Each structure stands twice: as C-alpha cells, then as structure tokens.
Amino acid sequence: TLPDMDTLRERLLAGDRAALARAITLAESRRADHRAAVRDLIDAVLPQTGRAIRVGITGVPGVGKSTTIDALGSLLTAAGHKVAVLAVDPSSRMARLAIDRNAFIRPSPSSGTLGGVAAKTRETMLLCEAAGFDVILVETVQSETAVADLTDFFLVLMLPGELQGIKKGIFELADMIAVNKADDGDGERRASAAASEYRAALHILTPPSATWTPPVVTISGLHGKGLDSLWSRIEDHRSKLTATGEIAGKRREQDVKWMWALVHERLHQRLVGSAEVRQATAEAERAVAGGEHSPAAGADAIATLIGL
Amino acid sequence: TLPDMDTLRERLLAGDRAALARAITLAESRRADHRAAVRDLIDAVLPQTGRAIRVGITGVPGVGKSTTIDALGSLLTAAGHKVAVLAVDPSSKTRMARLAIDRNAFIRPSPSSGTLGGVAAKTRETMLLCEAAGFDVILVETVGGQSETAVADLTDFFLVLMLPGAGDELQGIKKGIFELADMIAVNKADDGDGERRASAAASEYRAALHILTPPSATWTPPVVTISGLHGKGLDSLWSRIEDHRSKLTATGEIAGKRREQDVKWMWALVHERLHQRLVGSAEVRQATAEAERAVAGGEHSPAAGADAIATLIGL
Numbered sequence: 001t002l003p004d005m006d007t008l009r010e011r012l013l014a015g016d017r018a019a020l021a022r023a024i025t026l027a028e029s030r031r032a033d034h035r036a037a038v039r040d041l042i043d044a045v046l047p048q049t050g051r052a053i054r055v056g057i058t059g060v061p062g063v064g065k066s067t068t069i070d071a072l073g074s075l076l077t078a079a080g081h082k083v084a085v086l087a088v089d090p091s092s093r094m095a096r097l098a099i100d101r102n103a104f105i106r107p108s109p110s111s112g113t114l115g116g117v118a119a120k121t122r123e124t125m126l127l128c129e130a131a132g133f134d135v136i137l138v139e140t141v142q143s144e145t146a147v148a149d150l151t152d153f154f155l156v157l158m159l160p161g162e163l164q165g166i167k168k169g170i171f172e173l174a175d176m177i178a179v180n181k182a183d184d185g186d187g188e189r190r191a192s193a194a195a196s197e198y199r200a201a202l203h204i205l206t207p208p209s210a211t212w213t214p215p216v217v218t219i220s221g222l223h224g225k226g227l228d229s230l231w232s233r234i235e236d237h238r239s240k241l242t243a244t245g246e247i248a249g250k251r252r253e254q255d256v257k258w259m260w261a262l263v264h265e266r267l268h269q270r271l272v273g274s275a276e277v278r279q280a281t282a283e284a285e286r287a288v289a290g291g292e293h294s295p296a297a298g299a300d301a302i303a304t305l306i307g308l
Numbered sequence: 309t310l311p312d313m314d315t316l317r318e319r320l321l322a323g324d325r326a327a328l329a330r331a332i333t334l335a336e337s338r339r340a341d342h343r344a345a346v347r348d349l350i351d352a353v354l355p356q357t358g359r360a361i362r363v364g365i366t367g368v369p370g371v372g373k374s375t376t377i378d379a380l381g382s383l384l385t386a387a388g389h390k391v392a393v394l395a396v397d398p399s400s401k402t403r404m405a406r407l408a409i410d411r412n413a414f415i416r417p418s419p420s421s422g423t424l425g426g427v428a429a430k431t432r433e434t435m436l437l438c439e440a441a442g443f444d445v446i447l448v449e450t451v452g453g454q455s456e457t458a459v460a461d462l463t464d465f466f467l468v469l470m471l472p473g474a475g476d477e478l479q480g481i482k483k484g485i486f487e488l489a490d491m492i493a494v495n496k497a498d499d500g501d502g503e504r505r506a507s508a509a510a511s512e513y514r515a516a517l518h519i520l521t522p523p524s525a526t527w528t529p530p531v532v533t534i535s536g537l538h539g540k541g542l543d544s545l546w547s548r549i550e551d552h553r554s555k556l557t558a559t560g561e562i563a564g565k566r567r568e569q570d571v572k573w574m575w576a577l578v579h580e581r582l583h584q585r586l587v588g589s590a591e592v593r594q595a596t597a598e599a600e601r602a603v604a605g606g607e608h609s610p611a612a613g614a615d616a617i618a619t620l621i622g623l
C-alpha cells in the first residue's frame with residue numbers, strides 16, 4: 001500500500017535526484033500515510049542534514065531577485081556546489097538555473113497557514129540537505145520574517161534608489177544589502193551612491209559588539225557583476241558565526257519555532273476540516289475584526305468548537 | 309463568592325477604580341468561572357471601548373522609561389486625562405511613585421499566562437476594561453522576551469526611548485525594533501552636556517529614519533530629545549502623538565491597525581488554550597517538553613516533534 005521507503009531513502013542519500021523529487025511529491029499528496037511516510041523519512045535522515053549554507057533572499061518585485069538567484073546559483077554550481085532554490089509564498093524565470101542538473105528548484109508548499117508553509121519549507125530543506133545539497137537558497141514570493149527565520153544568512157536586495165524600498169521592519173534584519181543593477185557605466189555610480197545611503201543607515205543601527213557587521217554591496221544580477229564578492233561575504237559570515245556557535249544557536253531556535261508552527265497548522269486543519277466548524281470559526285473572527293465581540297470572547301467560542 | 313456582575317459593570321462604567329481593579333482581579337483568579345465572568349463583562353461593555361489614545365513604550369533597561377512614564381502620565385492627568393499604565397512581561401509601581409498616588413491614574417503589572425501571546429492578549433482585554441472605565445490614555449510598557457513587538461501590536465503609536473549615546477557598544481534597542489518606531493525619544497537630555505549628547509544621538513537616528521521612511525507614508529516618525537527626570541520636551545512629545553492620531557484617524561489607519569491587532573490577540577488566546585491543555589497534567593507537560601527538547605537538540609525533525617505533541621491531545 002505504501003512504496004518501498006527504505007529503498008527510496010537509500011537512493012536519496014546516495015544522491016538520486018528522482019528520489020528527492022519523489023519524496024517531495026509524496027509530501028504533497030492527499031493521502032495522510034504518504035505524508036506521514038515522508039515525515040518519517042526526514043526524521044530518519046536527520047543526522048545527514050545541516051551541512052549546507054542556508055541563505056534567505058528577499059526584495060521588492062522588480063529588484064532583480066529571479067535574475068540574481070539564477071546568476072548566483074549558476075556561479076555556485078560551476079564551482080562544484082549543489083544548489084536548491086525553495087520559494088515561500090503565503091498565497092500557498094531562473095531559466096538557466098532551471099536546466100542545470102546540479103540545481104533543484106521548487107515552488108512554495110501548500111498549507112493552511114503561513115507558519116505551515118514555512119515549516120514545510122524547513123522539512124524540504126532538510127530533505128535537500130540529506131540528498132547532498134550544500135547551498136539552500138530560500139526566496140520570498142509575512143514571508144520576509146519567515147524566510148529570515150528559515151535561514152542562516154538574510155540577504156536583502158534593493159533597487160538603486162515613493163514606496164517602501166523593502167517592507168517596514170525588514171531592512172534591519174539584513175546580514176547584507178545588495179544594491180542590484182550596478183550595470184557598466186552610470187548604473188555603477190548610481191548603485192554605489194545608493195549603497196552609501198543604505199550603508200549609513202545600517203551602520204547607525206549596528207552595534208560594534210555585533211559579531212557580524214552587515215556589508216552593503218553593489219551587484220548586477222543581469223551582467224554577473226559582484227557575485228563572487230557577495231558570496232565570499234556569506235562564506236565569511238558562516239566561518240565567523242560557526243566560531244561563536246551563533247549559527248547552531250539560531251538553527252535550534254528556528255527548528256522549535258517551526259515545530260510549534262506545525263502544531264498550530266494541525267489546529268488550523270481541525271478548525272477548517274468541517275463546514276460547521278469552519279463557518280463558526282469565520283463568524284467568531286469576523287465578530288472580533290468588526291468590534292462586535294472581544295478577542296477573548298471570539299477565542300473561547302473557537303476553543304469550545306473543538307473541545308479545547 | 310460570585311459577585312453581582314451587573315452592578316460591578318454599572319460602577320466600572322461610572323469610573324470607579326475599585327470596580328475596575330476588582331474586575332482585573334477576577335480576571336487573574338485561578339477559578340475559571342471568575343475569569344469567564346470577567347471575559348463576559350468585557351464583551352458586554354465593548355461598545356464603550358476604543359475612545360482612547362493607546363501608546364506602546366519601550367527602551368533598554370535603565371533608559372528612563374519608568375521616570376518618563378511617571379512624568380508624562382502626570383502631565384496628562386494635570387491636563388484632565390485619565391491615564392492607565394499597563395506592563396507586558398514575557399516571562400510572567402514604587403517606580404512611577406508620583407503617578408502611583410495620582411487619583412486619575414491606574415497602574416497594573418503584567419498579567420500571567422502560559423505564553424507571551426496569552427500575556428499580551430490579556431493585556432488587550434485589560435485595555436478594553438480601562439477604556440470602558442473612562443481611561444482615555446493607555447500607556448503599555450515592555451518589561452523583562454519578544455515583548456517589544458507584542459507592545460507595538462497592542463497600541464496605536466509605538467514610542468521608543470533611547471539613551472543619549474551608544475558608548476557601551478551594545479544594541480541601542482533590540483535589532484528589528486527601530487524601524488517600527490512611530491517616534492524615537494532620546495532621553496536624559498538634561499540642561500548642559502546631557503542635551504548636547506542627546507541632540508548628537510538624535511541627529512544619527514533621524515538620518516537613519518530619513519533614509520528608511522518613504523515619502524508615501526502617512527506619518528514620518530520624528531526624533532526628539534526629552535528629559536523624563538526634569539520634565540523637558542514632554543509636551544512636544546505628546547503633541548506629536550496627537551498629530552499622529554488625527555492624521556491616521558483621517559486615513560482609517562488606526563481602525564485598520566486595531567482590527568488586525570484584535571484578530572491577532574484572538575488567535576493568541578486560542579493558542580494559549582492549546583498550551584494550557586499541553587501543560588495541564590504532569591504527564592502531557594513532560595511529553596511536550598521531551599518533544600521540544602528533541603527538536604531543539606536535532607534528535608527529531610520539527611514535524612516529528614509536532615506530530616508527537618499534536619497526538620498527545622488528539623489533534
């Protein structure tokens with residue numbers, strides 16, 4: 001009734017890409033035993049995970065994120081890395097990387113809650129690491145904090161110059177800002193001028209006791225400029241924060257966060273699993289949003305629905 | 309032992325602080341029917357809530373937050389406001405000693421709960437009680453955890469207090485918190501050297517905010533200097549908070565933020581109820597700890613831990 005998960009596990013650990021893809025396919029099937037088998041497989045290969053650089057990447061639409069990931073991912077595969085690109089979308093391109101046999105690109109997983117989407121992304125990351133991927137890029141497509149809380153290093157891409165340049169509260173979380181579109185000629189001057197502004201703000205906000213002082217750099221994703229320097233900074237961070245234990249410390253905190261997120265996703269699934277409860281939950285939420293009932297009145301109405 | 313909740317409600321709505329205190333005191337009771345009765349009373353006076361300015365206040369230990377709230381709260385009661393000061397401690401007066409004897413102020417420590425979500429959500433409930441009792445200024449302060457974001461998500465206006473310099477080489481404020489500020493106030497701007505060092509620091513924070521704030525924002529956060537201890541700059545500080553209220557009331561943004569916050573604290577309480585079931589017997593509390601430890605220690609995957617926990621209570 002179930003597939004041969006022992007043999008799938010062995011093939012995956014031996015680097016068989018078909019096995020990695022199949023494990024991810026089984027995790028998104030409608031059968032609960034398929035999903036449980038892949039859960040059990042991930043748990044079984046946990047000791048072979050973690051040996052990767054996990055980089056989160058965000059930026060406003062049009063900044064050049066797809067292009068930059070495509071270019072950076074190709075630079076890394078050329079250099080002997082195996083690169084996974086995982087998207088995170090609460091609503092749940094890269095064409096050259098898409099044909100690269102050492103890259104593995106996946107869209108955002110489906111879940112009831114953004115916590116669930118993000119936590120499923122952690123589980124996919126672990127699968128990828130067990131399968132031998134040593135670079136995990138997680139991109140936003142809210143999702144920004146989730147992606148920072150999924151990765152070791154948070155890279156924010158910015159335009160080289162009346163809206164938010166990036167969502168309020170996200171700039172200060174950057175481990176590096178890369179100002180994109182530093183194209184030959186004036187593009188370089190402009191982006192470098194913009195980098196000087198972001199660099200002033202970020203260094204005002206960075207205490208000298210911080211282990212890592214976030215750099216601000218200029219790049220051209222389109223023309224492949226500045227990407228080696230960018231990556232070298234991520235590797236420097238890995239070395240420095242591995243030395244302090246701060247990468248382990250952050251991962252432990254993230255993993256507990258995603259565990260609780262999945263417990264909350266299980267709760268959410270119980271609340272939308274039947275029409276009555278789904279409607280009653282909606283009504284309570286509407287009453288609170290509308291100022292008709294207090295937040296605790298809505299909460300207790302919902303908690304009683306499922307005997308909590 | 310069951311109080312007359314209909315008469316308690318009537319007195320509270322009339323401004324009686326004793327009824328207000330009794331209601332908050334019944335809310336922290338270890339009896340579920342007391343707490344339920346207070347939950348019900350809040351839900352019943354909801355139409356009399358909301359007519360206040362809600363200000364969250366944070367800053368590093370020793371910045372002068374107690375002193376500034378004591379001074380600001382006194383300024384406001386002097387001007388005819390009734391001011392409530394509510395603390396949020398993630399791990400749950402004499403400071404604020406002058407405001408503590410003020411008949412038009414009401415100070416309460418942080419409520420206790422199993423989760424920070426719970427503490428914050430109970431603080432929202434207390435805020436509603438205070439508003440119903442006629443408090444028109446609600447100051448919510450961080451103490452002790454992730455209390456800063458919680459306090460920002462409890463209030464209309466987020467005030468961050470800063471020291472007049474960063475020579476201790478530490479975070480001047482939690483990473484992540486700065487850009488959330490609706491105003492930065494650099495405290496200890498005492499006549500003479502203090503105010504010079506405060507003005508210098510202010511210029512730096514103002515530059516960073518100038519860079520980060522887009523021109524489309526309804527509100528551009530100011531950076532000001534104050535002395536909570538000597539009562540300098542507090543009128544100007546409050547006038548800025550009133551300007552923000554007027555401006556974001558016109559755009560519907562205060563209502564919008566409040567709606568989002570209320571739904572957040574609703575879910576936080578649902579999650580607290582879940583937490584209560586998981587720590588409610590020694591056996592399940594320990595099994596939940598073991599799961600959490602296994603995940604923290606990289607012994608089992610987050611989903612393995614989660615499903616172990618969910619199965620403990622038949623989820």
Ligand SMILES: Nc1nc2c(ncn2[C@@H]2O[C@H](COP(=O)(O)OP(=O)(O)O)[C@@H](O)[C@H]2O)c(=O)[nH]1
Pocket residue numbers: 059060061062063064065066067068093180181182183219220221222223
């Ligand atoms: N001139 C220039 N254009 C770029 C660069 N990177 C991306 N773009 C362009 O910006 C547009 C948006 O890029 P895309 O990668 O889709 O942005 P995303 O929405 O951030 O994923 C496309 O026309 C890209 O070719 C760059 O370094 N220089």
Ligand SMILES: Nc1nc2c(ncn2[C@@H]2O[C@H](COP(=O)(O)OP(=O)(O)O)[C@@H](O)[C@H]2O)c(=O)[nH]1
Pocket residue numbers: 367368369370371372373374375376403495496497498534535536537538
């Ligand atoms: N010189 C000066 N000292 C202040 C000022 N505000 C607070 N303080 C002092 O700083 C210390 C900490 O103040 P407190 O209000 O307890 O700080 P909290 O820990 O942020 O609540 C106390 O000794 C205060 O008297 C101020 O405006 N000027």
